[PDB]
Amino acid sequence: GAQVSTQKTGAHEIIHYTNINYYKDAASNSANRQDFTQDPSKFTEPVKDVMIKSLPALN
Amino acid sequence: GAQVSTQKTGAHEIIHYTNINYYKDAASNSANRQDFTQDPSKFTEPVKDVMIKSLPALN
Amino acid sequence: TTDQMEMFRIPVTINAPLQQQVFGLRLQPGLDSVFKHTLLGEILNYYAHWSGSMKLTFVFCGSAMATGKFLIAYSPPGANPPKTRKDAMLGTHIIWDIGLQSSCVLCVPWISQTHYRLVQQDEYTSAGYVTCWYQTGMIVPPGTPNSSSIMCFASACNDFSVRMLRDTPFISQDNKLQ
Amino acid sequence: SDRVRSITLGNSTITTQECANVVVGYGRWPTYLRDDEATAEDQPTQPDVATCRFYTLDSIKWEKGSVGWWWKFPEALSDMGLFGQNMQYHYLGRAGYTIHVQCNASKFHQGCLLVVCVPEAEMGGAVVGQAFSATAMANGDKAYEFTSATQSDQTKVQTAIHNAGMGVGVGNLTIYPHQWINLRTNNSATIVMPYINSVPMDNMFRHYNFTLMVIPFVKLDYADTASTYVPITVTVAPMCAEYNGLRLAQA
Amino acid sequence: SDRVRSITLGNSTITTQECANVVVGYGRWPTYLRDDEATAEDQPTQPDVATCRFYTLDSIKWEKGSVGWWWKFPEALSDMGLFGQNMQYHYLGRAGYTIHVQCNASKFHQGCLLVVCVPEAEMGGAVVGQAFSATAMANGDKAYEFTSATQSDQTKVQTAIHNAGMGVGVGNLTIYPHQWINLRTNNSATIVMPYINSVPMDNMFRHYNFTLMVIPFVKLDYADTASTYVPITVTVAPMCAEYNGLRLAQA
Amino acid sequence: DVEEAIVVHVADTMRSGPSNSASVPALTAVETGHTSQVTPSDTMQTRHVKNYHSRSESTVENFLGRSACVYMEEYKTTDNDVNKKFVAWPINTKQMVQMRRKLEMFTYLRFDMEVTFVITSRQDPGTTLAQDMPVLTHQIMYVPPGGPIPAKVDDYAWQTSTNPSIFWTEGNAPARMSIPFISIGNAYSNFYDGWSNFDQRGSYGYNTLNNLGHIYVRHVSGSSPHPITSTIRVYFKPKHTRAWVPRPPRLCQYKKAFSVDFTPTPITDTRKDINTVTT
Amino acid sequence: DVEEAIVVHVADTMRSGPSNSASVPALTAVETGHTSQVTPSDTMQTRHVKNYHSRSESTVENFLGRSACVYMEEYKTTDNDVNKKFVAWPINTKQMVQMRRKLEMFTYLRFDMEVTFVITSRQDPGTTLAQDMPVLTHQIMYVPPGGPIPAKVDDYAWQTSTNPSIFWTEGNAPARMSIPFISIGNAYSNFYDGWSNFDQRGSYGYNTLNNLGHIYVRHVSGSSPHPITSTIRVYFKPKHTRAWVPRPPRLCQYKKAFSVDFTPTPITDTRKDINTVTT
Ligand SMILES: CCCCCCCCCCCCCCCC(=O)O
Ligand SMILES: CCCCCCCCCCCCCCCC(=O)O
Ligand SMILES: CCCCCCCCCCCCCC(=O)O
Ligand SMILES: CCCCCCCCCCCCCC(=O)O
Structure with missing residues (x-):
């Protein structure tokens, strides 16, 4: 019932920490501040036809 | 001696928590607030002969 | 109402204009005075949110020789409640025929923009209206009473649920009981 | 028991507890237009539940001296819900119908009604020759009354009941899809009419597909009761409706 | 060539011969509501071609002194064809939109427009506190004009252009789905907006889903020509529209 | 393992x-x-x-699994009246209206109990208040039925050798404990339609089955030069609950702590007429 | 395992x-x-x-995962005005400017909440201050919408049987708890461009969707001979955050707690000319 996962690097670089949940509600857990996925295409490239950077834009 | 069981869902959806009993009396345990079985037939259908919803009631 | 028991019975008469309203009410199970103290409203008043469909059952308690038809309609939320049967019939409704089976069920569907509604309903979470109208009229033979009564039953369906416990406002005290 | 019937169209339901069987047109159930019979090319619109639902067509009184009434469709529904809007906004239309007539009375009353749907019920004027406007036989959902005596006003149709306004014996209307309401036995009548025409589609304002008639063959009678009249109500539900040719509204 | 585009919705078509690419919302194409996200139980109605078609939203003049305009949707289409009728007759609605803005000028004109769709464009009043009716920011398809100077009338919204009526820098509206009309290069702009809300469906009269804004960043200029103004036209087409909760009309 | x-x-x-x-x-x-x-x-x-x-959230376990106040009383550290320096409460659940109504939705209940005590103190007003007093200590004593009862703050009965007790010092977390199902019958009864004597005479109603004991509280040895008043609040919290035979919620206001007596009340509120639907 | x-x-x-x-x-x-x-x-x-x-460090989880003050108010242990001895706050996030602006960078948010309470007390000035008072205790009560509301410090409503509450004693660590996602809709909405009534009338804006309840606070039983004033601060901390539809940060200063009203502001500061690059 114990999760083991790596902890963020620090100066001088067992880089492991242990976590256990004590409460019956998932809202009681600690923040999940270790997800780092991201995708800016939704805001930077919202166009329909794919645009090639090396090619000219309009025609 | 440790029980592992799932905890209720929450926003953003290891959904597991650990429990250990420390006292010798079962009355000291924590509330068992995770049973969700129910059966309303005792109060909604107390009749002797089974009634089919699609059929007419009296005859 | 000088007699409290008169509250439970809805009057009906033999001669009425061709289109006439029997009753009308707001669908606020936890707030409306009609549903406030019923077996469902009392349970709802211990909670803050509710969702699901409802059953309204109507039973005709006239003479065995009496007959008639009624139109019972549910009108979802809107800027104006129906004023005539022509308006009412545009919403969800059922035509009730009185015969050997004394009861008919209007199932109020769950039509809402949000998954849940507040028990202390406000204009944002309105739920609509329910009205009943004469469809054909009540006809009786000689030697029968000229008036009859109907009763209504309210209950929840199998998809009903509540949430967010709270204290009920119906009960209070001013001093410690002794 | 086979004396109970229930019909569910759209968000509306009809229940009858004392009724006869159901009559289905000429044995044909309503259906959508096929690909090998269509002529119009653009995509049809099929509102489905928004239009295929029961509409209650106002009510009338049955007196001891009543002679009969008629309604013309689909004009009777021309201003009823979204069916009327689709009629207004489209050039072409096509739909079948379910007609339900309610009439209930005690066991001590007597009387008999004929309920019949007449396709292409062309009617003649009161004065031979002349002409009449489209208000003498259709003005919305209001019902028009037959007359016992011969009509004399030149501005309206020949309402003589025994000819049914068509120059034919009233007793022979049994050839069309029909049903009887006999107060001893039943209190309702149900007819399902498919779409009948010589072309796949037609304009719903210009052409009257069929006419509904209710005629008391045995006049109402009763004695020593406080009920002076027996109301009659008509309910209609379009089936498998589809439209074509969108344009500016009105028609 | 990729400078030509053609869009076909219902019985209407749009052709542009000098245009930029097409912007699709947040990368999401409009679609119908799924079974595992719905909450309302009764069957929806999907008019399809009857409602999903291009409607032309009146026209305006671009002068040398123009400052900008905005439209609020779906109120702008509240009385347009069968879309308005379905809005009136139903409790709930849901639909995406395709917005096309036309503006053409010769090779000797200059100017630049920003076309942006702002979801939940809540606006503040001219006088802090107070209140305004639902006529200061939406009265049908008519366009409302921004103002260069600070607004003073308490009965209308704060129309100061440089704040966009929302208390934010006008230059940062690039974060929303947007496109530019630069007269040197293109003459149209096309944006496809999916349905964006915090609930699966909502009443189309009570709630403004999004606001369309057209703002001249570089003011129009020309010399020695007989054309005094450059008209601007807006066309909108609902996509994948569906409704629920039939009731008496009006809303 | x-x-x-x-x-x-x-x-x-x-x-x-x-x-x-x-x-x-x-x-x-x-x-x-x-x-x-x-x-x-x-x-x-x-x-x-x-x-x-x-x-x-609608289960009976969750519905009844909330701490609710059942009693509060005040006692002074020093005073002339002996009876006013300690409390003596016969345990019952009918004193406070809200939890009473929550419980009386069922006829029979069976559960373990969790009891929490909240104690606060304040100095009484007077013409001279300047004093220095160390932290106070309190004792809570539970006396099952038939046991000896103290008659004064310094009685011998407070030397519990078998009665459970708790000693609590101000400034810490509230006291708490667990209690099992201590009924002689197979379930607690909220209602009892019967008499005490076999010939249908004597006490009538639920009062006949209330034999749960008493609770006593005092300041251990605090006796300040100037009076100090303390208040205790008792909270109950059912655990492992089971219920039988639901009954309709009460409509009339409560008037007695050991009786069902009431005054007739209207069924509900009124409105203009049977068609009125507006606000 | x-x-x-x-x-x-x-x-x-x-x-x-x-x-x-x-x-x-x-x-x-x-x-x-x-x-x-x-x-x-x-x-x-x-x-x-x-x-x-x-x-x-740029993730929304870390960006919004900091405790920020949302409300503070004062209440006195004893006073002549009844309304001034307790607090009653309708929960909302628009009261404090910094966290308001942090939140309004997104249109819709969905998160769990962690609430922390900081309470401090001080004696009011006066001509005579010599008194001895034990440690005070405080109660925080949460009333979901539609529940009964207390009208005075010693009302019956404070006997919560179903409303959650916390009792806290001065000198300990601050109180804290967790709250799940309690919105009726699928996400919280910072902005709402719409009306309350179906005919486009009534309340306008975010004010229509704020139905989160109330928070009440009091001294449990402390009533000192001389007045004492306490202040409570409420801190919110989103957890498990998700956000949609970013929008530009606000430029104008805030002026109302339940409206977007503003005064026009210049786009930015000025400089001598378009070529000036020196300090
Ligand atoms: C109808 C209600 C029945 C519930 C049963 C209540 C039984 C009370 C048990 C606890 C009473 C004594 C608590 C104090 C114990 C201690 O402090 O020593
Ligand atoms: C726009 C902001 C939405 C965020 C949702 C905030 C909901 C507030 C939930 C907590 C309110 C009550 C906290 C006190 C609870 C307790 O002390 O009993
Ligand atoms: C309420 C749970 C309390 C847990 C106390 C700390 C853990 C003690 C057991 C040692 C870790 C083993 C846990 C496990 O078996 O999953
Ligand atoms: C009175 C019991 C105290 C238990 C203290 C916490 C548990 C320590 C041991 C780690 C968990 C293993 C328990 C087990 O072996 O079942």
């Missing part, structure tokens, strides 16, 4: 189309005592909907 | 040499609504660089 490993959701809505048949789900007869089981799918066309709502 | 076992880095720079070709990465067209994806490697000669920088 080290680790042993231990949702319902409401019913979904099924797609329904047009129908024309002899079956009549909508028509029923309430005379049988049967509640109709029709669903919207049986009277109108519906779409397929997958519900994920659950009735987790 | 006992132990279950659960970096991104920015893009590197690639070596680029001289080029002479028909491709023109630098030339683009902003009219398409497309933000150019060119990199320095596409317009000048560059060396190979291995970056180890990460965007860990």
Whole structure:
């Protein structure tokens, strides 16, 4: 019932920490501040036809 | 001696928590607030002969 | 109402204009005075949110020789409640025929923009209206009473649920009981 | 028991507890237009539940001296819900119908009604020759009354009941899809009419597909009761409706 | 060539011969509501071609002194064809939109427009506190004009252009789905907006889903020509529209 | 050996189309005592909907699993009246209205109990208040029925050798404990329609079955030069609950702590007429 | 069974040499609504660089995962005015400017909440202050919408049987709790461009969707001979956050707690001329 996962690097670089949940509600857990996925295409490239950077834009 | 069981869902959806009993009396345990079985037939259908919803009631 | 028991019975008469309203009410199970103290409203008043469909059952308690038809309609939320049967019939409704089976069920569907509604309903979470109208009229033979009564039953369906416990406002005290 | 019937169209339901069987047109159930019979090319619109639902067509009184009434469709529904809007906004239309007539009375009353749907019920004027406007036989959902005596006003149709306004014996209307309401036995009548025409589609304002008639063959009678009249109500539900040719509204 | 585009919705078509690419919302194409996200139980109605078609939203003049305009949707289409009728007759609605803005000028004109769709464009009043009716920011398809100077009338919204009526820098509206009309290069702009809300469906009269804004960043200029103004036209087409909760009309 | 490993959701809505048949789900007869089981799918066309709502928060365990106040009383550290320097409460659940009504929705209950005590102190007003007093200490004593009862703050009975007690010092967390199911019968009874004597005489009602004991409280040895008043609040919290035979919620206001007595009340509020639907 | 076992880095720079070709990465067209994806490697000669920088601290979870004050109020232990001895706050996030602006960078939010309460007390000035008072105790009560509301410090409503509450004693660690996602809709909405009534009338704006309840606070039983004033501060901390539809940060100062009203503000500061680059 114990999760083991790596902890963020620090100066001088067992880089492991242990976590256990004590409460019956998932809202009681600690923040999940270790997800780092991201995708800016939704805001930077919202166009329909794919645009090639090396090619000219309009025609 | 440790029980592992799932905890209720929450926003953003290891959904597991650990429990250990420390006292010798079962009355000291924590509330068992995770049973969700129910059966309303005792109060909604107390009749002797089974009634089919699609059929007419009296005859 | 000088007699409290008169509250439970809805009057009906033999001669009425061709289109006439029997009753009308707001669908606020936890707030409306009609549903406030019923077996469902009392349970709802211990909670803050509710969702699901409802059953309204109507039973005709006239003479065995009496007959008639009624139109019972549910009108979802809107800027104006129906004023005539022509308006009412545009919403969800059922035509009730009185015969050997004394009861008919209007199932109020769950039509809402949000998954849940507040028990202390406000204009944002309105739920609509329910009205009943004469469809054909009540006809009786000689030697029968000229008036009859109907009763209504309210209950929840199998998809009903509540949430967010709270204290009920119906009960209070001013001093410690002794 | 086979004396109970229930019909569910759209968000509306009809229940009858004392009724006869159901009559289905000429044995044909309503259906959508096929690909090998269509002529119009653009995509049809099929509102489905928004239009295929029961509409209650106002009510009338049955007196001891009543002679009969008629309604013309689909004009009777021309201003009823979204069916009327689709009629207004489209050039072409096509739909079948379910007609339900309610009439209930005690066991001590007597009387008999004929309920019949007449396709292409062309009617003649009161004065031979002349002409009449489209208000003498259709003005919305209001019902028009037959007359016992011969009509004399030149501005309206020949309402003589025994000819049914068509120059034919009233007793022979049994050839069309029909049903009887006999107060001893039943209190309702149900007819399902498919779409009948010589072309796949037609304009719903210009052409009257069929006419509904209710005629008391045995006049109402009763004695020593406080009920002076027996109301009659008509309910209609379009089936498998589809439209074509969108344009500016009105028609 | 990729400078030509053609869009076909219902019985209407749009052709542009000098245009930029097409912007699709947040990368999401409009679609119908799924079974595992719905909450309302009764069957929806999907008019399809009857409602999903291009409607032309009146026209305006671009002068040398123009400052900008905005439209609020779906109120702008509240009385347009069968879309308005379905809005009136139903409790709930849901639909995406395709917005096309036309503006053409010769090779000797200059100017630049920003076309942006702002979801939940809540606006503040001219006088802090107070209140305004639902006529200061939406009265049908008519366009409302921004103002260069600070607004003073308490009965209308704060129309100061440089704040966009929302208390934010006008230059940062690039974060929303947007496109530019630069007269040197293109003459149209096309944006496809999916349905964006915090609930699966909502009443189309009570709630403004999004606001369309057209703002001249570089003011129009020309010399020695007989054309005094450059008209601007807006066309909108609902996509994948569906409704629920039939009731008496009006809303 | 080290680790042993231990949702319902409401019913979904099924797609329904047009129908024309002899079956009549909508028509029923309430005379049988049967509640109709029709669903919207049986009277109108519906779409397929997958519900994920659950009735987790409506269980009796969660409904009754909240701490509620059942009694409060005041006692002074020093005073001339001996009876006013300590409290003596016969345990019962009818004193406070809210929890009373929550409990009386069922006829029989069986549960363990969790009791929490909240104690606060304040100095009484007077013409001279300047004093220095160390932290106070309190004792809570539980006396099962038939045991000796103290008659004064410094009686011998406070030397409990078998009665359970708690000593608590101000400034710490509130005291707490657990209590098992201590009824002689197989379940607690909120209502008792009967008498005490076999010839139908004597006490009547629930008062006959209340034999749970007493609770006593005092300041251990605090006796300040100037009076100080302390208040104790008792909170109950059922655990592992089971209930039988539900009954309708009460309508009339409560008037006695050991009786059902009431004053007649209207069924509900009124409105202008049977058609009024506006605000 | 006992132990279950659960970096991104920015893009590197690639070596680029001289080029002479028909491709023109630098030339683009902003009219398409497309933000150019060119990199320095596409317009000048560059060396190979291995970056180890990460965007860990820019995530919305970390950006919004800081406790921020949302409300403070004062209440006195004893006074002549009844309304001034307790607090009653309708929960909302628009009271304090900083967290308000942090939140309003997004249109819709969905998160769990962690609430912390900081309470401090001080004696009011006066001509006579010599008194001895034990440690005070405080109660925090949460009333979901529609529940009964207390009208005075010693009302019956404070006997919560179903409303959650916390009792806290001065000198200990601050109180804290967790709250799930309690919105009726699928997400919280910071902005609402709509009306309350169906005919476009009534309340307008976010004020229509604020139905989160109330919070009440009091001294449990403390009533000192001389007045004492206490202040409570409420801190919110989102957890498990998700956000949609970003919107530009506000430029104008806030002026109302339940409205977007503002006064027009200049776009930015000025400088001597378009060529001025010096300090
Ligand atoms: C109808 C209510 C029945 C519930 C049963 C209540 C039984 C009371 C048990 C606890 C009473 C004594 C608590 C103080 C114990 C201690 O402090 O020593
Ligand atoms: C726009 C902001 C939405 C965020 C949702 C905030 C909901 C507030 C939930 C907590 C309110 C009550 C906290 C006190 C609870 C307790 O002390 O009993
Ligand atoms: C309420 C749970 C309390 C847990 C106390 C700390 C853990 C004690 C057991 C040692 C870790 C083993 C846990 C496990 O078996 O999954
Ligand atoms: C009175 C019991 C105290 C238990 C203290 C916490 C548990 C320590 C041991 C780690 C968990 C293993 C328990 C087990 O072997 O079942």
